[PDB]
């Protein structure tokens, strides 16, 4: 038993809710919140910009130190940093950005990072400003993640479309 509430169960291990991931993280304080990161951990907009703003820019300060030490992530890769006031940990995962021409097959590799964590709060990777089809992103998530994932979808219209079209 865990503290996530109001989710629709899609599969044995995947759950989904129309929710603002920032507000969900603050309420649940999950062990892991997933950030829709870029390779530079520049959290300017989308989910990343919102998460970082909620931490009063502490996420960005920590991230800049990480990059200065380690260099950029790979597309499809991840790193674990602090969750600040939102979670124990933040798993920063880089899905391919279609608006940069990155290979959509890297989406599966991105979701594989979720399997290193028993339970996660996450957005749909490569959705929103990353330019991928969220329905496809949900399918890859369901077909790749084996651990327990609670998906927060900000847009109500999109959430209803994801549920109604789910096979
Ligand atoms: O900006 C904020 N949040 C916020 C911003 C952006 C996103 C986001 O990229 N989602 C991904 C997404 C969907 C959705 O979630 O709609 S459908 C879909 C389909 C394919 C791929 C992805 C995808 C998520 C959350 N919050 C600040 C105002 C307080």
Swiss-Prot record:
Q: How is its activity regulated?
A: Inhibited in vitro by GRL-0617.
Task: Give residue ranges for domain Macro.
Answer: 1-167
Write out the annotated subcellular location: Host endoplasmic reticulum membrane
Domain of life where this protein originates: Viruses
How does the entry describe its membrane topology? Answer: Multi-pass membrane protein
Q: Which reaction does it catalyse?
A: Thiol-dependent hydrolysis of ester, thioester, amide, peptide and isopeptide bonds formed by the C-terminal Gly of ubiquitin (a 76-residue protein attached to proteins as an intracellular targeting signal)
Query: How does this chain assemble?
Result: May form homohexamers. Interacts with N protein.
Q: What does this protein do?
A: Responsible for the cleavages located at the N-terminus of the replicase polyprotein. Participates together with nsp4 in the assembly of virally-induced cytoplasmic double-membrane vesicles necessary for viral replication. Antagonizes innate immune induction of type I interferon by blocking the phosphorylation, dimerization and subsequent nuclear translocation of host IRF3. Also prevents host NF-kappa-B signaling. In addition, PL-PRO possesses a deubiquitinating/deISGylating activity and processes both 'Lys-48'- and 'Lys-63'-linked polyubiquitin chains from cellular substrates.
Name under which the protein is recorded: Papain-like protease nsp3
Q: Which species is listed as the source?
A: Severe acute respiratory syndrome coronavirus 2 (2019-nCoV)
Which part of the full protein is shown? 1025 to 1191 of 7096
